[PDB]
Amino acid sequence: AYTNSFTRGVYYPDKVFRSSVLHSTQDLFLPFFSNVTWFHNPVLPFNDGVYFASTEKS
């Protein structure tokens, strides 16, 4: 299965404080509106980092 990663995958690239600032930084991010694999215990590659998400009720 596949799903749209609308605007998710943004993480604080460091431990630096900034207030009311537009900062440009290049690093490994999840591209917007890209494909994310959806599963309902397969082994997957770990090319350059993995964003993982889970919805839980139990």
């Binding site: 604080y12 431990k15 630096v16 404080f17 207030s19 600032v21």
Partner: protein
């Protein structure tokens, strides 16, 4: 006026009681022009 060396950064300046609210995981401040502005003291949980 002191020459200071916090966890990984070094500089010269005066450390004063701050007014900001750093997050529990933030250590070093930064002004708009990529200049160190505030730091978290490693021992005392106070922002300088």
């Amino acid at each position: 006026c002191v020459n200071f060396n916090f966890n990984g950064l070094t500089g010269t300046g005066v450390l004063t009681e701050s007014n900001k609210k750093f997050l529990p995981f933030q250590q070093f401040g930064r002004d708009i022009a990529d200049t160190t502005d505030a730091v978290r003291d490693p021992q005392t949980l106070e922002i300088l």
